[PDB]
Design an enzyme around this catalytic site. Structure first.
Site, PDB file in Angstrom:
ATOM      1  N   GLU A  35      30.644  44.863  43.383  1.00  0.00           N
ATOM      2  CA  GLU A  35      31.787  44.769  43.319  1.00  0.00           C
ATOM      3  C   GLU A  35      32.782  45.714  44.215  1.00  0.00           C
ATOM      4  O   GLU A  35      33.534  45.411  45.083  1.00  0.00           O
ATOM      5  CB  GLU A  35      32.625  44.674  41.763  1.00  0.00           C
ATOM      6  CG  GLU A  35      32.216  43.216  41.337  1.00  0.00           C
ATOM      7  CD  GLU A  35      32.785  41.923  41.818  1.00  0.00           C
ATOM      8  OE1 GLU A  35      33.652  41.969  42.573  1.00  0.00           O
ATOM      9  OE2 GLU A  35      32.614  40.729  41.201  1.00  0.00           O
ATOM     10  N   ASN A  46      41.851  38.268  48.248  1.00  0.00           N
ATOM     11  CA  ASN A  46      41.069  36.658  48.047  1.00  0.00           C
ATOM     12  C   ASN A  46      41.800  35.812  48.963  1.00  0.00           C
ATOM     13  O   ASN A  46      42.897  35.933  49.153  1.00  0.00           O
ATOM     14  CB  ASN A  46      41.093  36.513  46.471  1.00  0.00           C
ATOM     15  CG  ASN A  46      40.671  37.716  45.560  1.00  0.00           C
ATOM     16  OD1 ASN A  46      41.085  37.875  44.381  1.00  0.00           O
ATOM     17  ND2 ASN A  46      39.303  38.140  45.985  1.00  0.00           N
ATOM     18  N   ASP A  48      43.023  33.312  47.781  1.00  0.00           N
ATOM     19  CA  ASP A  48      44.198  32.455  47.167  1.00  0.00           C
ATOM     20  C   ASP A  48      45.299  33.484  47.420  1.00  0.00           C
ATOM     21  O   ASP A  48      46.352  32.997  46.896  1.00  0.00           O
ATOM     22  CB  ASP A  48      43.873  32.172  45.844  1.00  0.00           C
ATOM     23  CG  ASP A  48      43.636  33.308  44.960  1.00  0.00           C
ATOM     24  OD1 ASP A  48      43.564  34.570  45.461  1.00  0.00           O
ATOM     25  OD2 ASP A  48      43.300  33.000  43.940  1.00  0.00           O
ATOM     26  N   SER A  50      45.748  36.434  46.049  1.00  0.00           N
ATOM     27  CA  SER A  50      45.559  37.394  45.021  1.00  0.00           C
ATOM     28  C   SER A  50      44.573  38.657  45.710  1.00  0.00           C
ATOM     29  O   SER A  50      43.949  38.467  46.794  1.00  0.00           O
ATOM     30  CB  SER A  50      44.911  37.007  43.807  1.00  0.00           C
ATOM     31  OG  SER A  50      43.616  36.526  43.951  1.00  0.00           O
ATOM     32  N   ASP A  52      41.670  41.812  44.546  1.00  0.00           N
ATOM     33  CA  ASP A  52      40.907  42.487  43.471  1.00  0.00           C
ATOM     34  C   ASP A  52      40.905  43.800  43.497  1.00  0.00           C
ATOM     35  O   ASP A  52      40.951  44.555  44.883  1.00  0.00           O
ATOM     36  CB  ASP A  52      39.435  42.150  43.509  1.00  0.00           C
ATOM     37  CG  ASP A  52      39.253  40.421  43.551  1.00  0.00           C
ATOM     38  OD1 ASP A  52      39.796  39.871  42.594  1.00  0.00           O
ATOM     39  OD2 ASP A  52      38.269  39.952  44.027  1.00  0.00           O
ATOM     40  N   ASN A  59      41.279  41.176  39.220  1.00  0.00           N
ATOM     41  CA  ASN A  59      42.219  40.303  40.001  1.00  0.00           C
ATOM     42  C   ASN A  59      43.736  40.289  39.796  1.00  0.00           C
ATOM     43  O   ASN A  59      44.030  39.967  38.575  1.00  0.00           O
ATOM     44  CB  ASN A  59      41.573  38.818  39.882  1.00  0.00           C
ATOM     45  CG  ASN A  59      42.456  37.855  41.025  1.00  0.00           C
ATOM     46  OD1 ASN A  59      43.166  37.001  40.541  1.00  0.00           O
ATOM     47  ND2 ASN A  59      41.940  38.068  42.284  1.00  0.00           N
ATOM     48  N   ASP A 101      37.131  36.706  27.567  1.00  0.00           N
ATOM     49  CA  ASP A 101      37.886  35.249  27.935  1.00  0.00           C
ATOM     50  C   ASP A 101      37.191  34.137  27.597  1.00  0.00           C
ATOM     51  O   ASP A 101      37.589  33.042  27.528  1.00  0.00           O
ATOM     52  CB  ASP A 101      38.635  35.292  29.156  1.00  0.00           C
ATOM     53  CG  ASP A 101      37.512  35.100  30.608  1.00  0.00           C
ATOM     54  OD1 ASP A 101      36.827  33.989  30.390  1.00  0.00           O
ATOM     55  OD2 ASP A 101      37.835  35.618  31.612  1.00  0.00           O
TER      56      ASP A 101
END
Ligand SMILES: [Cl-]
Ligand SMILES: [Cl-]
Ligand SMILES: [Cl-]
Ligand SMILES: [Cl-]
Length: 129
Positions: A35, A46, A48, A50, A52, A59, A101
Protein backbone atom coordinates in the site's frame (compact mmCIF):
# COMPACT_ATOMS: atom_id res chain seq x y z
CA UNK A 1 8.28 8.51 8.42
CA UNK A 2 9.49 5.56 6.48
CA UNK A 3 9.30 2.55 8.85
CA UNK A 4 11.62 -0.42 8.81
CA UNK A 5 9.80 -3.72 8.33
CA UNK A 6 10.37 -5.04 11.91
CA UNK A 7 9.88 -1.52 13.33
CA UNK A 8 6.40 -1.41 11.75
CA UNK A 9 5.75 -5.01 12.86
CA UNK A 10 6.51 -4.04 16.47
CA UNK A 11 4.34 -0.86 16.28
CA UNK A 12 1.40 -2.80 14.79
CA UNK A 13 1.77 -5.58 17.41
CA UNK A 14 1.91 -3.04 20.23
CA UNK A 15 -1.31 -1.52 18.86
CA UNK A 16 -3.01 -4.96 18.90
CA UNK A 17 -3.21 -5.61 15.12
CA UNK A 18 -1.51 -9.00 15.46
CA UNK A 19 -4.34 -11.56 14.90
CA UNK A 20 -6.97 -8.79 14.94
CA UNK A 21 -10.19 -10.24 13.32
CA UNK A 22 -7.99 -13.35 12.74
CA UNK A 23 -5.34 -11.60 10.57
CA UNK A 24 -1.87 -12.51 11.72
CA UNK A 25 0.78 -9.79 11.91
CA UNK A 26 2.47 -10.64 8.57
CA UNK A 27 -0.80 -9.85 6.76
CA UNK A 28 -0.73 -6.29 8.08
CA UNK A 29 2.97 -5.83 7.32
CA UNK A 30 2.52 -7.27 3.84
CA UNK A 31 -0.46 -4.92 3.22
CA UNK A 32 1.51 -1.88 4.43
CA UNK A 33 4.49 -2.80 2.20
CA UNK A 34 2.44 -2.84 -0.97
CA UNK A 35 0.00 0.00 0.00
CA UNK A 36 2.63 2.56 1.16
CA UNK A 37 6.14 1.03 1.16
CA UNK A 38 5.90 1.53 4.94
CA UNK A 39 5.76 5.37 4.31
CA UNK A 40 3.38 7.16 6.68
CA UNK A 41 3.21 10.18 4.30
CA UNK A 42 2.01 8.17 1.23
CA UNK A 43 -0.96 9.67 -0.61
CA UNK A 44 -2.62 8.39 -3.80
CA UNK A 45 -5.59 9.76 -5.75
CA UNK A 46 -8.10 7.11 -6.83
CA UNK A 47 -10.06 7.12 -10.12
CA UNK A 48 -13.22 8.17 -8.34
CA UNK A 49 -11.63 11.36 -7.02
CA UNK A 50 -11.10 10.01 -3.55
CA UNK A 51 -7.58 9.73 -2.15
CA UNK A 52 -5.88 7.03 -0.03
CA UNK A 53 -3.76 8.16 2.91
CA UNK A 54 -1.02 6.77 5.09
CA UNK A 55 0.74 3.46 5.76
CA UNK A 56 -2.56 1.55 5.11
CA UNK A 57 -3.90 3.79 2.34
CA UNK A 58 -7.17 4.57 4.04
CA UNK A 59 -9.76 6.12 1.64
CA UNK A 60 -11.41 9.55 1.82
CA UNK A 61 -14.83 8.50 0.46
CA UNK A 62 -15.72 6.35 3.46
CA UNK A 63 -13.20 6.67 6.36
CA UNK A 64 -11.55 10.09 6.73
CA UNK A 65 -12.27 13.71 5.74
CA UNK A 66 -9.90 15.37 3.23
CA UNK A 67 -12.17 18.22 2.37
CA UNK A 68 -12.31 17.45 -1.34
CA UNK A 69 -14.15 14.12 -1.68
CA UNK A 70 -17.87 14.64 -2.41
CA UNK A 71 -20.13 12.28 -0.47
CA UNK A 72 -17.45 11.66 2.14
CA UNK A 73 -18.39 9.71 5.08
CA UNK A 74 -15.66 10.10 7.57
CA UNK A 75 -16.59 6.87 9.38
CA UNK A 76 -13.33 7.07 11.38
CA UNK A 77 -14.13 10.68 12.29
CA UNK A 78 -10.68 12.02 11.55
CA UNK A 79 -9.01 14.31 9.09
CA UNK A 80 -7.20 12.29 6.48
CA UNK A 81 -4.05 14.29 7.23
CA UNK A 82 -4.02 12.63 10.79
CA UNK A 83 -3.38 9.35 8.96
CA UNK A 84 0.02 10.69 7.77
CA UNK A 85 1.56 11.07 11.22
CA UNK A 86 4.77 9.19 12.13
CA UNK A 87 2.64 7.83 15.03
CA UNK A 88 0.45 5.09 13.47
CA UNK A 89 -2.26 5.16 16.18
CA UNK A 90 -5.00 6.84 14.04
CA UNK A 91 -4.28 4.63 11.06
CA UNK A 92 -4.47 1.47 13.20
CA UNK A 93 -7.70 2.51 14.93
CA UNK A 94 -9.26 3.30 11.57
CA UNK A 95 -7.92 0.02 10.05
CA UNK A 96 -9.59 -1.89 12.91
CA UNK A 97 -12.96 -0.38 11.86
CA UNK A 98 -12.33 -1.12 8.15
CA UNK A 99 -11.35 -4.78 8.69
CA UNK A 100 -14.44 -5.26 10.88
CA UNK A 101 -16.77 -3.98 8.04
CA UNK A 102 -17.59 -7.52 6.77
CA UNK A 103 -15.04 -8.17 3.93
CA UNK A 104 -12.10 -8.46 6.34
CA UNK A 105 -8.77 -7.56 4.74
CA UNK A 106 -10.24 -7.84 1.23
CA UNK A 107 -10.93 -4.12 1.70
CA UNK A 108 -7.22 -3.66 0.86
CA UNK A 109 -6.85 -4.26 -2.92
CA UNK A 110 -3.05 -4.68 -2.45
CA UNK A 111 -3.63 -7.27 0.29
CA UNK A 112 -6.10 -9.27 -1.82
CA UNK A 113 -3.82 -9.16 -4.95
CA UNK A 114 -0.34 -9.47 -3.34
CA UNK A 115 -0.60 -10.92 0.19
CA UNK A 116 -3.67 -13.18 0.35
CA UNK A 117 -2.71 -16.74 -0.32
CA UNK A 118 1.03 -16.16 0.15
CA UNK A 119 3.45 -16.92 2.99
CA UNK A 120 2.78 -13.67 4.83
CA UNK A 121 4.82 -14.82 7.93
CA UNK A 122 7.84 -14.11 5.73
CA UNK A 123 7.11 -10.41 6.36
CA UNK A 124 7.83 -10.74 10.13
CA UNK A 125 10.75 -13.17 9.80
CA UNK A 126 13.85 -12.05 11.76
CA UNK A 127 11.81 -9.62 13.83
CA UNK A 128 12.28 -9.57 17.54
CA UNK A 129 8.59 -9.36 18.37
CL1 LIG B 1 11.09 -4.46 3.18
CL1 LIG C 1 2.20 -13.81 10.19
CL1 LIG D 1 3.41 4.31 16.32
CL1 LIG E 1 -2.96 -4.66 -6.38
Amino acid sequence: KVFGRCELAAAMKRHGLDNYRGYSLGNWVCAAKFESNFNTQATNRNTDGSTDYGILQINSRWWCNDGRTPGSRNLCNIPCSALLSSDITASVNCAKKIVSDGNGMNAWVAWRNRCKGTDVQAWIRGCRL
